[PDB]
Amino acid sequence: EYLSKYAIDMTEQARQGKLDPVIGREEEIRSTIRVLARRIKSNPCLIGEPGIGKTAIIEGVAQRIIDDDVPTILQGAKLFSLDLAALTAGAKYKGDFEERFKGVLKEIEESKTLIVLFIDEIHMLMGNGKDDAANILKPALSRGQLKVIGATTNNEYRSIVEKDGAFERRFQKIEVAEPSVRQTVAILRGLQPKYEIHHGVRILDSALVTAAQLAKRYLPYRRLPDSALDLVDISCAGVAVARDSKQNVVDSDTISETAARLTGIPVKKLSESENEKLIHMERDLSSEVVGQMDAIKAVSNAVRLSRSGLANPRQPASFLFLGLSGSGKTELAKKVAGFLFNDEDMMIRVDCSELSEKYAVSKLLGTTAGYVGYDEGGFLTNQLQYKPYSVLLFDEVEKAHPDVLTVMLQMLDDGRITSGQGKTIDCSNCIVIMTSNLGAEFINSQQGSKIQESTKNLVMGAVRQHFRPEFLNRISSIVIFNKLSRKAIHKIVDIRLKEIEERFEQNDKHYKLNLTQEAKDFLAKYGYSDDMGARPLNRLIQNEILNKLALRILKNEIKDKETVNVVLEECLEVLPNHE
Amino acid sequence: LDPVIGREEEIRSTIRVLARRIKSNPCLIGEPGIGKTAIIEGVAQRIIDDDVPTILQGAKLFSLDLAALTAGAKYKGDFEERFKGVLKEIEESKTLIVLFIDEIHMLMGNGKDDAANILKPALSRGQLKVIGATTNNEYRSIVEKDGAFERRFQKIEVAEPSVRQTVAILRGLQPKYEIHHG
Amino acid sequence: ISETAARLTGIPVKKLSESENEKLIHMERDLSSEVVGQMDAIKAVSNAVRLSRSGLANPRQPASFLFLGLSGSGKTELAKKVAGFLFNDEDMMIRVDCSELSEKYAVSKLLGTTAGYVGYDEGGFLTNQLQYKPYSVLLFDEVEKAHPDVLTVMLQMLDDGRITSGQGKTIDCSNCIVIMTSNLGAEFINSQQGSKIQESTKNLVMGAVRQHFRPEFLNRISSIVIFNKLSRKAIHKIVDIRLKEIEERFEQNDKHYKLNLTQEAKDFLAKYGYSDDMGARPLNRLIQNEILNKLALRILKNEIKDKETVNVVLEECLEVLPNHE
């Protein structure tokens, strides 16, 4: 009776059509059967990554028995799935759980046709460093009795073997593999009617294909038999939800949207409104960043290329921004994040300006087991796992120690980067921007505005002297920022003045600066340092205007709508009815 | 319970996952202090107002304590019994019962083992829907060790709401504070 | 018995199928159809694979290579195509990011950490992969960046396949292939004195190797292999290959080429992408810069839905099918 209380009759579940129909995996199913067909230690075990179909194989075998597709040894056999229930019943009256366990084995053992016992999470039976693990399945399997099928993960197997020894002897591992995308789809097709029936939705074959493809590309941490199903099942659920208050059909687009929600990857949304945003991306960035159109275009291409799906799945977009300091290198990256997340600071930043090798590698990746801290991934690993397509910005990669840059070297080509604790993170479908001021050395030759021939040669000469080709050749594009022209300065001043207004927390403490009057000319004239980019503008605005404004505010001379003009420098007005 | 403001996508996504045939176990993930458990209660409120997908229409949502795990361990195995009991009561399906586990990493177990089948193979059967809640750090401490949980549960990213959203939230909660403080 | 063992260990060596004979005696043919030129590297690998598959390989020496060459010459690529062949899946490869192998961590990262210390997740990458997939190809990217202490561990691994784990177990990764890559000789290959790396230049490369790795390691590699700089002719073939891969990776295959200019475009790219010291990488870049980016706009603008055509611009451009929908 024990067997009916502490285990599930998997062959009955197969008989009743409750188990997912099993598709493919013939070598694996066959191997399990062949091992069960053994006489001594007829004890197979399915080992492999958590999502590859281990119990599906077991269920498959249950079906093969029901379907009369087994050896005469197995024909007429019954398969049970052992629960922990026998053990959960309690260790009250010391050893009784072992007796119940033994009772299960005894019922099985006494020739009630051939009974095979299967155990989920079988590593649990390694018990208390042996001891409580008792004789669980030990003399049983040793004598070839009580045929057992076990299944667990790679890591658990490692723990079983390591800690027990004897179990390794008793069990015959069978490796189970993740199916290919094509195989995955075939499986999905096989499962399709169960999903369609459950949800009450129709699934197009295109959708099934789509899910497997997307799963391979966008759910790297979880194996295809699961990941593809999550996309199918969830997409179906999506449709099922629509059916609650609103065409019950799942297609590739539904899945792609679902994937975007699931993974955070915006590439899969596919909207007409997106198209307009991307088409005019350059305009929007040019209204934030003045000039530097080549840089704007360079990035825009990365985004558009990625959003179209054309970007190579293994080549994170990668840019190196060379250019004269203050030309807007960091600023561009921020504005790109602005565009992509509606948040200039959403991006992941790596302050490479601070990277002495000894520490630098570990700061980005973290430690291996056994070292101080296991809170791995200071910056790259931890951030990449939650914001997998975000903009990753490296400030002054030029100054990073040459060795830490080789972490980036790897990151930049074929996604993979691994944590200190051993996980592949894979910064794949994302954008990487790196910065350097190295090129300033030649740009400051004042060769007009747009970078000229020779200037660019020297800039690239220097970058070649500084970084090894191994790195440079992995960059999608090296962009050299242009010098800002006085004309650019006029545009910049406008933008800056607008940002100043927008950032005011107190919506009264703002200007009506006569920026249409000589005030803009003053700023453009005085702030145009040929070689400090736009930075002098921030300083002039503070020295010429905001500092004075602060005083006007402190003295309560200001309510709102402050105005500015120039005398002989910038001068602020007061509101005449004030002190 | 306090009302939930915004977070519509989170509520929708959570339920959508619960609507799944198998492994219908969403988990909220994000930095602490962002409203993860608020979302969970938001779902409870949608259930009370019944503004939910068919699968939840008349469903219950329970928050599991660790008392199930820890309230006495003489007669080792009793906590396992507590879980088989609880999980069985959920499986009973008097109505649809969804279980919420706060601090979901707490069921990881000391070197697993204790973890038993607490919410393990059962989740793949379509019953015992579980909603989790964790942080990036906790998540890593579960996932990198269990493997199977990473598969069983489906994380949902939960963003820090923007300042704009924050204000809306504050307005929404304003009367609770005004009433409490007077 | 042999077949049974193959089933249990996964090792194809023991299957002995006739169909393998053709794939193996022609492995070079097929690798050369993926990797252009670089025949010595191709032969080097194929010989190792064949010794294993034919049952001649010595169990105490995992096959190993040290591939030297210019970046963009196909070092990583070859290894992947080989893994592709061996498993019918390039993702089966076990990879090591050697650039991450700073002294204090690298050993423990690959082998694991000893009992008593935080985390017993031994095996990080090597033990954990090797204990399940015995004949996986290992790939070490830029081994010259690994701290010498790490390279020392490889020396141990490269004989008897014996590697100890952090917790004291052995791996015995006998029947496998180990690929190490390096850019140390790039400085001499860049002399461009030839097509096939020239003799003598070859010794300069050995010089770079000998001054970086200790001899104790170097004489242990089954063979040190040097990739050739790519020739212009190679580039023509490479371009063709990339264009095919590009079409193949279009998972949403409405987005596909007819390409057109089936000579002219390829020649344009071959001409412009033939950078003497950057291997094939510039070809990838030109295609994105000159073609795919433009395609992205044609897609975004609803100008092209399928049947993509490239024209020469006297650069290159794409022709609109639907009229800007």
Ligand SMILES: Nc1ncnc2c1ncn2[C@@H]1O[C@H](COP(=O)(O)OP(=O)(O)OP(O)(O)=S)[C@@H](O)[C@H]1O
């Ligand atoms: N070949 C297949 N045939 C039928 N169903 C499959 C197949 N592969 C996967 N599935 C489904 O997707 C899952 C595959 O993995 P499962 O066996 O459920 O999980 P697992 O691989 O057993 O890992 P554990 O041991 O349960 S953590 C199953 O739960 C099935 O629902």
Ligand SMILES: Nc1ncnc2c1ncn2[C@@H]1O[C@H](COP(=O)(O)OP(=O)(O)OP(O)(O)=S)[C@@H](O)[C@H]1O
């Ligand atoms: N081309 C530009 N358009 C608009 N604003 C700009 C531009 N260039 C610089 N700025 C201003 O420059 C400031 C930030 O410049 P950054 O990009 O940080 O300096 P940089 O160009 O990165 O040089 P480094 O490397 O950071 S010294 C912002 O306050 C911007 O307003």
Ligand SMILES: Nc1ncnc2c1ncn2[C@@H]1O[C@H](COP(=O)(O)OP(=O)(O)OP(O)(O)=S)[C@@H](O)[C@H]1O
């Ligand atoms: N969107 C929201 N609508 C209404 N109230 C909210 C919202 N977000 C947060 N709150 C309130 O803000 C508080 C913080 O939320 P919590 O869920 O406690 O934080 P948390 O994200 O759960 O952090 P942990 O993980 O539980 S420490 C909650 O107590 C809610 O009452």
Ligand SMILES: Nc1ncnc2c1ncn2[C@@H]1O[C@H](COP(=O)(O)OP(=O)(O)OP(O)(O)=S)[C@@H](O)[C@H]1O
């Ligand atoms: N001979 C070749 N035939 C075909 N493709 C090639 C060839 N050489 C290089 N490639 C391409 O180069 C890219 C992969 O880079 P690799 O050439 O392996 O870089 P590498 O040669 O490994 O130098 P490292 O060590 O990775 S910097 C792929 O896009 C390959 O297709």
